[PDB]
Amino acid sequence: ALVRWLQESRRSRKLILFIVFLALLLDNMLLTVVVPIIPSLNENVQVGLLFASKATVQLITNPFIGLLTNRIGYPIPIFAGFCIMFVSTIMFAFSSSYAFLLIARSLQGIGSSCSSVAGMGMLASVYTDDEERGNVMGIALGGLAMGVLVGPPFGSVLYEFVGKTAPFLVLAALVLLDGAIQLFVLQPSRVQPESQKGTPLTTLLKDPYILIAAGSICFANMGIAMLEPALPIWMMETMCSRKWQLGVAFLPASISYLIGTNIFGILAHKMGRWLCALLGMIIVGVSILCIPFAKNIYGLIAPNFGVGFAIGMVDSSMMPIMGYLVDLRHVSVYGSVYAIADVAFCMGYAIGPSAGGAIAKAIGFPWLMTIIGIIDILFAPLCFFLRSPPAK
Amino acid sequence: DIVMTQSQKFMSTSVGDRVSITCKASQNVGTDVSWYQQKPGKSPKPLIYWASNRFTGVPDRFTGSRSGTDFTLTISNVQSEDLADYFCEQYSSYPLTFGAGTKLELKRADAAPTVSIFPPSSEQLTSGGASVVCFLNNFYPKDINVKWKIDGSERQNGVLNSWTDQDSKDSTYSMSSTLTLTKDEYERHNSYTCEATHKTSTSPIVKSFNRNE
């Protein structure tokens, strides 16, 4: 706002949440703007590799950043993720080959891993209260929904009204503004190793109560990851829908996520996080089961709403529970426990398009949806074990 | 403004017990509350920041918790160096507001005060001033009442009271009450009395004298 407000105020912890939200929003906007422009060895191999590069590289780089945050601190990885994201945006703006696009996607994956892991660990470290941690984590998770909701129209408007490189140049400018905001809250020039050494990643992966939450997130997000690309193909084949209907059919699934992540961050602590996740998994299963029973565009409005709402419920309930569990049963170091959560998010986006296409070609879209729904419903009862884990 | 209400001004504890100090917010301050400890002859130092985190160097005895708008500082194993003042601040919204401090004190058996009365000295009388002094020493319950009588007059003017902090060796209190009168007024009356009302005895302890002595 006004320079007077900037120069005369106590820097609150809400600035860290704002930084995390902005970084996640810009990351998702960059991820979503590129997709309409990608078509511009075998072409089937090239397209699949280009689609899976970002998620695969982020998945590979998550644990290293998790250990790095403990070794040196959060702000330096946050700033590094910033710099890598800006370089990736510039490379997208000024490239025309295929190898350069692949390199840009890989760099974006590295930067996204850094930003997500470091920011979520930082938020967990500065917000040790369960209720406030849940609230801030829901607010931060709303950034993904905001980005995936704003990206496509922004890219489409800037593509034909100004030029091809205009969306990327504008996004790079927004990134520069984000870094300008970042430079006034952090000190990305000093190494600040944490006081206590966290538990080994192998020890955390042997904890049943962490694996359950990670599997909840993974199985919840895999359904949307496999449904997002497969739905337009089925709609074109069956409903003979037009070009804009393909875009607008999936709009409720993003609006409902945006609503749910913001609203349930508060209600999860009141109603029981285990119960919230259980109900979210059941609702995702039922909605995905009901998706292939629609014959018109109007039949896809309610199931998509349910899918998005319940995925938001699951994410906002099981995001703070990782920090809660590591506090309850392990050492209160959050760098390496949110790497597991990020890997759970990234697995579905990595293996979504390829597996979804293979299964849809093999048995069909309705059978794929039925499989996803049955898997989610069967996994839902496992959340009962998170209501009262044994203490340390 | 946000008023941070700290309920009890003085609290009595024992070495090895557990003590809890409460601070209630007014307009939903969210974990933006800090706790400070001020030793009897030193400047304040922070103990708890962000309402739950313990400052570096603070022992593990001190802990902080929040339940809605209520903030609690708990000392699990009170020691001899934990007797000090504790206060809470909120910085969620300007201006900063501090709760009224809470002082930790030791506990001991009740002791009846020792009452002594002293008439004006000869040197003061030669200067035209008269002062009658009453010392109330060595009583544990801090709450004491004093009352002056001149032939049953119940005077409230000219009474000057001074209170001592808790004794380090004995953990007991003392008080002095001075009645200042002019020489002419002092010479007119005959009997003077100082009486103390305390928890230990329902009947007040009286110490009286006569000018004719």
Place this chain on the structure above:
Amino acid sequence: EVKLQESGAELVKPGASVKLSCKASGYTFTSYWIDWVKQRPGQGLEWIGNIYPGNSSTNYNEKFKNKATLTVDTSSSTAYMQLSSLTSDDSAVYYCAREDYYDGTYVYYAMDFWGQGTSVTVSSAKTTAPSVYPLAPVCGDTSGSSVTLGCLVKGYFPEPVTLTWNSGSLSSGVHTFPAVLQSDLYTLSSSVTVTSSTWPSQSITCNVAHPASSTKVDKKIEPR
């Protein structure tokens, strides 16, 4: 080592301004905020204001806008607070504190270093020599359990007065009460409890010394 040093005490006439100093050492002065706070005896702390020595940007409590003015001298790394049109309500202890940032960030979490307070007293009185009076027990009253004595100090304006019994020989049963200000003059009293046989045989003397106005009076308590 971080250190904020303040003046010990200040004496100011009613309706006059005072300038309190807070000298900072052991760190870069222009990088941390400085907070001025007020504590009135028997009451809670009151926040007066913020100042940032770098930008010289201030924050004031709306209750203290007219009374307090915060300035900074960066050449000598000093923070000044000026109080204007002082009244008897302004007699309090003023504290200077420094705000610390969370490690690796610029967010505030606590006031880690405080300076010792400055005791400002607003009185129109002048320096006066104290008057000491020996308090002997009432005539008769020859109790065998114990006998108590005392000396009364009256009429001295400057606060610091030291009272000792036999030049520190007696310190066991000696009770000394805090001075209290009435009619712009302080009053002090102390008592010593000794055995019944000691006082008639062994002399007891109350020693009072006034630093501000050089005066040392030794009074011998004698039976009435």
